[PDB]
Amino acid sequence: RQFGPDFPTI
Amino acid sequence: MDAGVIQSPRHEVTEMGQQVTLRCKPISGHDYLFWYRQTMMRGLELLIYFNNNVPIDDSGMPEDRFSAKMPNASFSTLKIQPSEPRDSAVYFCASSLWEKLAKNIQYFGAGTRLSVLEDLKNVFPPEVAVFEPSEAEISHTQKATLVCLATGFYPDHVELSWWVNGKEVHSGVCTDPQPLKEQPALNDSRYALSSRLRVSATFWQDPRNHFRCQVQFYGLSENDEWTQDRAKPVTQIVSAEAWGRAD
Amino acid sequence: MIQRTPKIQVYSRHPAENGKSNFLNCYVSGFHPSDIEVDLLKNGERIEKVEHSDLSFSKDWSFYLLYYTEFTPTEKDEYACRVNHVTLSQPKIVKWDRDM
Amino acid sequence: EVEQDPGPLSVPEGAIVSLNCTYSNSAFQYFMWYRQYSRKGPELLMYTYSSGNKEDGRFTAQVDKSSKYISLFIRDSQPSDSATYLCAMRGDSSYKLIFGSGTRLLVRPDIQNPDPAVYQLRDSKSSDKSVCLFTDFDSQTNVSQSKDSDVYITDKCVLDMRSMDFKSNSAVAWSNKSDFACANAFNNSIIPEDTFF
Amino acid sequence: GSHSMRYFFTSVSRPGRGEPRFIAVGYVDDTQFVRFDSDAASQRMEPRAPWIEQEGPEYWDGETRKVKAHSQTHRVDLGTLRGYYNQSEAGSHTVQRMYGCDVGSDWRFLRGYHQYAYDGKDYIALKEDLRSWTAADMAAQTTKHKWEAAHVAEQLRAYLEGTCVEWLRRYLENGKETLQRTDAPKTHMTHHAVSDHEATLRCWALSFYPAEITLTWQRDGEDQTQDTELVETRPAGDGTFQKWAAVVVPSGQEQRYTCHVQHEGLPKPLTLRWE
């Protein structure tokens, strides 16, 4: 199970 | 202030069978965009959201007739075709950024209030009347209440405002938060709305002073066809008025 | 930019026995960037329908892939992996040696 | 699915109010509350990750993931808190929120010098017909419909003349009818103060 | 023994094509269990091990949504990084992210990690305390401030110490028949004359799991580094691994050399000697 919902942009 | 989220149209009253297009411009720089709707039957609910213009979760989209696009970072569209009465709702667009969403912040537009009707012949603009202060009220309280009655309109897309000597006033005003049905028996019953404006007895008794209850009604546009006897019930303003008087 | 040339091992899944079904593997690793061409050869000719694993990478960021196909080793057929990558001025050919 | 009682809740100004939601799905991890005024968009109040207690001014949001029960408390409630309160929640697979159906809260204004009165208001241009204003009554009084589509009655509403620190309640009734006069029985509890001539 | 769950995400820009190529894979220990490829037709996260197939639709919809969102973020990042380095729009570049967690033999949290690279070099990483960041250069320092403002570490920390570790234990249990097996190495020795006066001894370990293994040559019972060679541990294709270690010896002294093999699957470390 992945991290979520999502990542910030760099 | 930089702009918030802009939605259009603010109001739409239309006949079933047509295509409706709702539009949203997110806050520039925001990279997420959400479409919600709110009704009495199902509450407040997400239809779809986008990130970097791509649809991420569309599990709330109705399975037919509804289509959402985001062709560029500045613009999204939600389309309904053919529209049906049950599509009537307030549709809200919002935008956000990752760092705001991590704090559960999103920025909402003002919404689009959509009524899709079976039949446009049920659409009526309001009749508007103003009622002048009781003389008993003036001498017992040294104050004076005007009342505005907006009656017989369908559907309920009205914005009532008070104007005193050419300028809109807020202080002293109280408008019912919701319309009442002129016959609660029927579905497409017409509506009524009241408002009050109170000022000192002194301010009413000046003959220089001029009051006006104003109602903006949202109805037909001139792309809608109309062959009835009566006047086409278009989007329009209906006002009534009174001047001050001492005796 | 930093570029890292691939390490190549060519080998069978099971101990090779002539006439017996097996898998030929070419494992490429330690490379960057990820774009790479890998063919398996039978007597100098490309084998068609070779499969590969999904691109992944190591602690040092360098990539690795396993290419493989079913084959039946014989005494006289020669097998090889051929690899091309930006770091190579020409494709590298590594012959399968059954005791490696 | 989240369960939220619709109310309406009616409380006097200055009261503590308690709102809550129940949910079923243990995957929810983020819990929020919104206020929405009539005909406007939802405004985020308070937001709680996972469990625990979170204060901001007169508001406290709380989450109990064992009982799956979340609540918002409003101290020292004010007329301007009158709104619909919605809870919303999500997991971590999506930004999609699930909302409760909302609880309507009415905070009744404290009217310090009531003067309950019922008045006839004559139309400005020419409708010898008129309306009756029931005004200046305190917020213990509640208001009800007429018995017949002959007669039209709007619920009470509160106005703020802020120039003169002064507020008052009002309700309005009308008809076109001869048999209609202000000084008649209605379907609700007021005290004995009128006026007429 | 110890265990890990790791996710790997690679995106490569392709000037002249519509979008970067994005490839994501997830592992438990050395075993692959899911993948996503932006160019493939399914547009879903897909099972790559049998034990993950039992997860239901909510699982697959969620994992596919996250990995699709992640492809979009890597796409925007490739543009941002090009702009930060003032690089031509003509070149192809790469972004990589990996994250995951380890547990010990007791299955409790040991450590979590999250790291990012641009063109194969460290860009930014979460440090072991899961509160702070190391940045490679000034571009990465601007990113670090952004992530600090947005409390990214806190949310990563919550996941790595919580969900990451729980779902790992869940997988370890639902896949126990293949993830908690040890296949002891099948072991043998090979001999070849390499010269007139020299021979190579090669000690083999085959069909073992997990990949971790140590192979050493001794001579007279003393460790031997000179004239030895160790190949990289390599996958067999069937879930197991292979490795060998060779030593070149004066011919006729073969019996002085001994190969020593240590693997979890071995109650005791093996010693082999030429025939």
Residue numbers in the entry:
A (entry chain C): 1 to 10
B (entry chain E): 0 to 246
C (entry chain B): 0 to 99
D (entry chain D): 3 to 199
E (entry chain A): 1 to 275
Mind quoting what the paper says about this structure?
We demonstrated that the TCR from the 1E6 T cell clone bound to HLA-A*0201–ALWGPDPAAA using a limited footprint and very weak binding affinity. Here, we solved the structure of the 1E6 TCR with 7 altered peptide ligands (APLs) determined by our previously published combinatorial peptide library (CPL) screening, 2 of which mapped within human pathogens.
Our data demonstrate the potential for an autoreactive TCR to bind with a conventional binding mode to a stable pMHC with antipathogen-like affinity (KD = 0.5 μM) depending on the peptide sequence. For example, the 1E6 TCR made only 47 peptide contacts with A2-MVWGPDPLYV (KD = ~600 μM) compared with 63 and 57 contacts with A2-YQFGPDFPIA (KD = 7.4 μM) and A2-RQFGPDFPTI (KD = 0.5 μM), respectively. The stronger ligands all encoded larger side chains (Arg or Tyr) at peptide position 1, enabling interactions with 1E6 that were not present in the weaker APLs that lacked large side chains in this position. The enthalpic contribution in each complex did not follow a clear trend with affinity, with all but the 1E6-A2-RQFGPDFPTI interaction (ΔH° = 6.3 kcal/mol) generating an energetically favorable enthalpy value (ΔH° = –3.7 to –11.4 kcal/mol); this indicated a net gain in electrostatic interactions during complex formation. Conversely, the stronger-affinity ligands A2-RQWGPDPAAV (KD = 7.8 μM), A2-YQFGPDFPIA (KD = 7.4 μM), and A2-RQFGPDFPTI (KD = 0.5 μM) exhibited favorable entropy (TΔS° = 2.2 to 14.9 kcal/mol), indicating an order-to-disorder change during binding, possibly through the expulsion of ordered water molecules.
